[PDB]
């Protein structure tokens, strides 16, 4: 019975995998909607901002691999929290979204198979640019197909599968509505009688 609508349930997202090695831009836009086109690691990072689905605020605390001199304990005390799982999907690489299955599912659902599973297409701003080509250029270009992505999201049945470059926003408000809907899970006392 969550309190009335709204309220920053706080959504700590655990991004797993790299996907076209371009997940940075996502976190950037996840907070500044301005990926590396005009963003770079020149200041302290790691934080949660508050977004808005339809007028409700939901913080998103992004958490990637380790990388802290402080050396946190093997078991963080964030157990009692959200901790969603943003499986970075790769539509700008050759079936890169599939290595995701190989180690990302064993890192998110085999690890925390609670519900928050969001398959998000990454670096989609280069899916149409040669930018993501050097990333692989094995195929001199190769974006995920409609039989590729659904192919593995069908294998994990995440919370939801989409595509949206960090800065593009063709579905970030959706992955963000999901990432939050995956870490804020609203009550289900809906009213029937259509």
Swiss-Prot record:
SUPFAM superfamilies named among the record's database cross-references: P-loop containing nucleoside triphosphate hydrolases
EC number(s) from the headed UniProt entry: 3.6.5.2
Membrane topology: Lipid-anchor
This protein's GO CC annotations: apical part of cell; cell-cell junction; centrosome; cytoplasm; cytoplasmic ribonucleoprotein granule; cytosol; dendrite; endoplasmic reticulum membrane
Compartments, as annotated in UniProt: Cell membrane; Cytoplasm, Cytoskeleton, Microtubule organizing center, Centrosome; Cytoplasm, Cytoskeleton, Spindle; Midbody
Disulphide bonds in the chain: none
Listed name of the protein: Cell division control protein 42 homolog
């Amino acid at each position: 019975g969550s309190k009335i609508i709204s309220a920053m349930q706080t959504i700590k997202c655990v991004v797993v995998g790299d996907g076209a090695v371009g997940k940075t831009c996502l976190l950037i836009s996840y907070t500044t909607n301005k990926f590396p086109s005009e963003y770079v690691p020149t200041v302290f990072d790691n934080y949660a901002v508050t977004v808005m689905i339809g007028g409700e605020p939901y913080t998103l605390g992004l958490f990637d691999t380790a990388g802290q001199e402080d050396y946190d304990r093997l078991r963080p005390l964030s157990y009692p929290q959200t901790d969603v799982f943003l499986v970075c999907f790769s539509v700008v690489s050759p079936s890169s979204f599939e290595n995701v299955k190989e180690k990302w599912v064993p890192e998110i659902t085999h690890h925390c198979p609670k519900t928050p599973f969001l398959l998000v297409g990454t670096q989609i701003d280069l899916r149409d640019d040669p930018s993501t080509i050097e990333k692989l250029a094995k195929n001199k270009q190769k974006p995920i197909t409609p039989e590729t992505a659904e192919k593995l999201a069908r294998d994990l049945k995440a919370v939801k599968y989409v595509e949206c470059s960090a800065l593009t926003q063709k579905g970030l408000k959706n992955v963000f509505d999901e990432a939050i809907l995956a870490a804020l899970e609203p009550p289900e006392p809906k009213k029937s009688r259509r």
